[PDB]
Amino acid sequence: KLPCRVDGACDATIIKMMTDLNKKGIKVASVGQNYLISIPASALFADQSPRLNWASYSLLNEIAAFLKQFRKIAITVTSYSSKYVSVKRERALTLARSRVVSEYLWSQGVDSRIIFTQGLGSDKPITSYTLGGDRSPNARVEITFRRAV
């Protein structure tokens, strides 16, 4: 009569979603009990504008379906961009991008208590090759959380 597992979740489904996202190009990493999803900005937004494409909602639905497989308390969404005009425009653009992404994620049915949003502009790069614009690897959005129990 008691449940035997957490509902709507399966380890085979978790492995399949991780493999499909890694083959698609979205980076999924797990160290210990922390989980990281790294997404390039060109697959979600337009050329340095906080407007989502209409075709990125399928990818966002896939990410939400992966996120429903775990139990968690707080999620963090952090945005990074490149150098275009000045630091204020980059910070406002990254905050708007994180706001839109987290708004659609909260509109979908993730069972989390808190979602934090921040945009850091171009302060923390991961690659010294900074020749591209939004096609640069260090222009991204990151979704981090910890699995609870």
Binding site: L2, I73, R113, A148
Partner: protein, 91 residues
């Protein structure tokens, strides 16, 4: 008259030793233990009890709570900001 201070069985409930003469109850859905001694229910857990109301309470140094309350087959608890229910059998 001065009201009584507490019930001294809750120190043993905090330590995890059941009161003498009591019987065990089965608790499902969370990390909690319960005993029934004199038509009263003693619960040892570290969750927060919200709905049914308790008569006496003590707290240990590491954050464990001990409650003295009436018997009830359901408990309403808050885990980490989420409200859920625990089922008590054997009453």
């Amino acid at each position: 008259g001065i009201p009584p201070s507490a019930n001294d069985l809750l120190l043993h409930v905090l330590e995890g030793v059941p009161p003498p003469g009591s019987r065990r109850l089965v608790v499902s859905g969370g990390d909690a233990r319960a005993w029934l001694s004199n038509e009263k229910m003693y619960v040892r857990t570290n969750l927060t009890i919200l709905s049914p109301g308790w008569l006496a309470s003590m707290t240990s140094a590491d954050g464990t709570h001990a409650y003295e309350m009436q018997k009830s087959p359901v408990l309403l608890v808050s885990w980490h900001g989420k409200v859920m229910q625990l089922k008590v059998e054997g009453l």
